[PDB]
């Protein structure tokens, strides 16, 4: 699906982003609700791995933008 121009991008841009891990512990999923929710409804496995464009899927950076400007604010 994803084909980054690595092959022909020369080496002018960085491929992977080198960054320190998130200062945050992992959080549990469904395991919590299992006992008190009336039902635990599973979803189509095909959705489980497809990275699809979110409804808040676009944003733009321009030289008019000034640091601090919010490009997008996603709420879980």
């Amino acid at each position: 699906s994803s084909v980054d121009g690595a092959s022909g991008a020369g080496q002018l841009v960085p491929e992977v982003n080198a960054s320190d891990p998130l200062a945050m512990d992992p959080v549990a999923g469904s395991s919590t609700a299992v006992a008190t929710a009336g039902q635990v409804n599973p979803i189509d496995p095909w959705i489980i791995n497809n990275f699809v464009q979110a409804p808040q899927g676009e944003f733009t950076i321009s030289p008019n933008n000034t640091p601090g400007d919010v490009l997008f604010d996603l709420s879980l």
Binding site: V3, G5, G8, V52, Q53, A54, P55
Partner: protein
């Protein structure tokens, strides 16, 4: 469909049915001094001809190629 290939097309006029898979190759002509990506989405029959958003195009099994690619993009 057989119509995509003139040979097959000419043949269809001799048989009354068909089944099979084609192989598609997209080939782009660009420098190492360009940038931009294209996206090919596989749309199943029985969907509709409604227009999509690039974001939506992502929801289908797809291939995103960078313009600089030298090798032909093969999509089944």
């Amino acid at each position: 469909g057989p119509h995509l290939n003139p040979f097959l097309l000419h043949l269809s006029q001799m048989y009354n049915g068909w089944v099979g898979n084609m192989r598609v190759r997209i080939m782009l002509a660009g420098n190492a001094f360009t940038a931009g990506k294209i996206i090919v989405s596989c749309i199943p029959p029985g969907f509709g001809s409604h227009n999509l958003t690039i974001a939506q195009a992502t929801l289908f099994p797809h291939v995103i190629a960078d313009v600089r690619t030298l090798d032909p993009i093969e999509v089944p």
